[PDB]
């Protein structure tokens, strides 16, 4: 009789960390119907049909992969196929990849992509279902799969109770109270950040795992941090689980290294330059032992070349591999600013001098202390720079101001809120004509210590003085960089809008398929971040200035963070560094020509647009259906006001009741996730791997004259420079940190690819995502002519030699500087 043929492939467990053991009555498929219903109008049921054989025949499947041969009985009764049940009777859980129902014709082919866990059958309250790839909104889907549909988002969705399991799939939010540890000391004590107006912060996905005694409002320490089953990647290669790098870091590595300086086995201090820069040259000598404890774990591994008994070398940072010294150079101290790891947080100054908007009851005179006429502009006036539009600034003044007191009050901290003053060049580059080092003087509360204005300087102390000035200028860009630009704003800002996806939009959903490539990993390493890297003493805390108030100095900044302000002309605009002109293709024009970031951004950005405003069309033809989506009506309500609740009342949130209010958010998302992260990500260990470069910390103010911190400012400004910033042990915790965040795993789907090939079946939509993959290509050509263009050599490479390639979209796996994943995976 009839019988549908039918391929699954799976892998088994070991592959991502005998085939016979399928076969038998191990795995039972059950086809549902799309188009024939039972009396309560959904989908019928066919029997249980399990795996007969295993496929060898076929063209080579990708590595770990095993197919299996079933045929399943399907008379005219049933329909159409268009969702299958699977149970799992063995014991251990398999990595289901597909199931493909073979026809007469390729036309005919049924294909379903699963790409998920499947856990033994008893581990679920209800049989996992699986939808073949026809994309469908609400109003769209075939009758027989309406309550399938809407039941699996249910399940998805939870009750807001219990603690997450390994195989559970439930996405919900939670506030971020899982970072202290108060149970175990008061030291680890954390405000909650997210609830409150007071610490607003972005939902981050619920773990359950219950209060801790000293705190109720604390969640309870764990071994494992959950997320939903299929966000936590599985790799075929351990060297690919990047992620899990942070934990072996924080857990093994930083007390081995800790151990060998508590020891007194390596000198506990840089004492020259060329003792930093040592560490990728010769290495570092440390104790066998911590050597072996370091050297076999995975992902740590990589991070060192090693004899495997005394030393560990660092890769040459990109920064450093033409020119040792150019880091120290003024141009490329400003060149960074545009081109470097952090390149968004300059802006264009239209007034003389920078005004403050804090109030100097609280801190004194916040006027700033630069004068137009100490400055030295290339021989313009300083009415000619504001007119002709070539002041710039780097203002961490009012972003520092509140907490430079209680950073100032911990041991070994110390910091200035900064301003640093830019004059574009009629060669087109910056210049750094002033900074700024402000402290808050309460009048009753004040030290001693005094703000001051720093000038350019190139030979005697006052040389060493304005290398200072950028080295605490470069710490407070440091931290900006990590927490705000890179954190809150990729990280922490899209961890919502992932849970308000799987909650509310069916994997049939056009708008879910659209978005999901963009949200790999992205769970997983946040949740890992959460248990290592921005939890009480963690990496973070125990390398950057802010210490214990890094987190929270974060939240203070999401106050003010602006959905509409991601996009990234809004953010051209809105930062002075560009004008809004209809007579240029992308609607701007940039105030710096050669602003490498911004130029490239714009290419990127242009390609997302169009690419969504031409999927966009093919699933809704005119507003009223997009008001009329009532799955996308709920995710967009939840994910402002659950997912982003704390901001949920701002004006600027799109009300999503037309085509260009879909367009705009899924344009902003795809940005935020893929371009912006990689532009902040990708150049940590290229820019920051020489710590003289990047400073994570400052542990003094400025010296006093006639003081031997000033006689050594004078007599050895290597070693004033090295005591002033990051010290040796969490230098090298830091660069460790960095360089593992700064690697392209090889198993990374990049912007323009996807895993698989047949995510969708509607041709118009696979189409429209061909053409935006080749106009990816195109435009990664012509950044390569950027680059090669002599012209820009300025500000593309400046005076270390390093084309700016962070917006190139394609890449090879490591440490390269370059490529565009779709999401923040690392
Ligand atoms: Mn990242």
Redesign the pocket.
């Known amino acids: 009789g009839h019988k549908i043929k039918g391929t699954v492939v799976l892998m088994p467990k070991n592959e991502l960390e005998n085939l016979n053991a399928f076969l038998g009555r191990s795995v039972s498929l059950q086809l549902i119907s799309a188009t024939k219903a039972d009396a309560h109008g959904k989908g019928k049921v066919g029997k249980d049909t399990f795996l007969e054989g295993i496929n060898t025949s076929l063209p080579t499947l990708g590595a770990g992969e095993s197919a299996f041969n079933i045929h399943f009985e399907w008379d005219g009764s049933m329909g159409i196929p268009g969702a299958f049940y699977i149970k799992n009777y063995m014991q251990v859980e398999f990595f289901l990849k597909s199931l493909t129902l073979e026809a007469i014709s390729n036309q005919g082919t049924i294909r379903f992509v699963c790409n998920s866990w499947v856990y033994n059958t008893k581990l679920y309250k209800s049989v996992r279902i699986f939808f073949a790839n026809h994309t469908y909104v609400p109003s769209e889907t075939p009758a027989p799969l309406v309550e399938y549909r809407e039941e699996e988002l249910k399940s998805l969705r939870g009750n807001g109770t219990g603690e997450r399991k390994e195989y559970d799939r439930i996405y919900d939010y939670d506030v971020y109270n899982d970072l202290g540890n108060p149970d175990k000391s008061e030291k680890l004590a954390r405000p909650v950040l997210g609830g409150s107006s007071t610490f607003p912060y972005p939902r981050r996905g619920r773990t359950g795992r219950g209060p801790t005694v000293t705190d109720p409002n604390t969640e309870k320490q764990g071994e494992v941090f959950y997320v939903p089953r299929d966000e936590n990647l599985g790799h075929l290669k351990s060297k690919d689980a990047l992620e899990i790098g942070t934990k072996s870091l924080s857990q093994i590595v930083q007390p081995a290294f800790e151990s060998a300086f508590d020891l007194k086995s390596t000198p506990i201090e840089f004492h020259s330059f060329q003792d930093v820069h040592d560490l990728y040259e010769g290495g570092i000598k440390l104790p066998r032992d911590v050597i072996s404890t370091i050297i076999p774990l995975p992902v740590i591994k990589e991070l060192y070349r090693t004899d495997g008994q005394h030393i560990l070398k660092f890769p040459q940072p990109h920064v450093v591999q033409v020119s040792q010294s150019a880091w120290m150079t003024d141009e490329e101290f400003a060149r960074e600013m545009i081109a470097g790891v952090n390149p968004c947080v300059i802006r264009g100054l239209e007034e003389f001098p920078p005004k403050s908007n804090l109030d100097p009851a609280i801190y004194g005179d916040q006027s700033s202390k630069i004068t137009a006429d100490s400055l030295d502009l290339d021989g313009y006036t300083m009415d000619e720079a504001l007119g002709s539009r070539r002041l710039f600034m780097l203002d961490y003044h009012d972003i520092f101001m509140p907490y430079v007191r209680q950073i100032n009050q911990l041991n070994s901290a110390k910091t200035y809120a900064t301003r640093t003053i830019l004059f574009l060049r009629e060669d087109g580059t910056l210049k750094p004509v002033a900074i700024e080092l402000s402290l808050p003087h309460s009048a009753g509360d004040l030290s001693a210590a005094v703000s001051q204005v720093v000038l350019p300087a190139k030979e005697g102390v006052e040389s060493t003085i304005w290398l200072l000035a950028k080295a605490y200028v470069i710490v407070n860009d440091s931290c900006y960089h990590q927490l705000m630009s ?1 954190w809150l704003n ?2 922490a800002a899209m961890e919502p809008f992932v849970i308000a996806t799987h909650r509310h939009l069916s994997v049939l959903h056009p708008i879910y398929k659209l978005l999901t490539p963009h949200y790999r990993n992205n769970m997983n390493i946040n949740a890992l971040a959460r248990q290592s890297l921005i939890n009480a003493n963690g990496i973070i805390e125990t390398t950057f200035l802010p210490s214990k108030y890094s987190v929270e100095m974060s939240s203070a900044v999401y106050k003010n963070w602006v959905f509409t302000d991601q996009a990234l002309p809004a953010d051209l605009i809105k930062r002075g560094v560009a004008i809004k002109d209809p007579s240029t293709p992308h609607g701007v024009r940039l105030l710096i020509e050669d602003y490498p970031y911004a130029a490239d951004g714009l290419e990127i950005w242009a390609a997302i647009k169009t690419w969504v405003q031409e999927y966009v069309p093919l699933y809704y033809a005119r507003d009223d259906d997009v008001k009329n989506d009532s799955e996308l009506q709920h995710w967009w309500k939840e994910a402002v006001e659950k997912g982003h609740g704390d901001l949920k009342d701002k004006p600027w949130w799109p009300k999503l009741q037309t085509l260009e209010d879909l367009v705009e958010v899924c344009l902003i998302i795809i940005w935020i996730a893929s371009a912006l ?1 990689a532009a902040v ?1 990708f150049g940590q260990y290229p820019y920051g791997g020489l710590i003289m470069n990047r400073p994570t910390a400052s542990r003094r103010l400025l010296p006093e004259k006639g003081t031997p911190e000033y006689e050594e400012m004078i007599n050895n400004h290597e070693k004033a420079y090295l005591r002033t910033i990051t010290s040796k042990l969490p230098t090298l915790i830091s660069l460790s940190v960095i360089e593992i ?1 700064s690697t392209h795993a090889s198993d990374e789907v990049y912007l323009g690819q996807r895993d698989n090939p047949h995510w969708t079946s509607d041709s118009k939509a696979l189409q429209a995502f061909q053409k935006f993959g080749n106009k990816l290509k195109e435009i990664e050509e012509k950044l390569v002519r950027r680059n090669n263009d002599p012209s820009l050599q300025g500000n593309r490479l400046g005076p270390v030699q390093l084309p700016y390639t962070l917006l190139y979209p394609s890449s090879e796996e490591g440490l390269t500087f370059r490529g565009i994943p779709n999401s ?1 995976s ?1």
């Open positions: 890179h990729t990280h992260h990500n965040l923040i690392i």
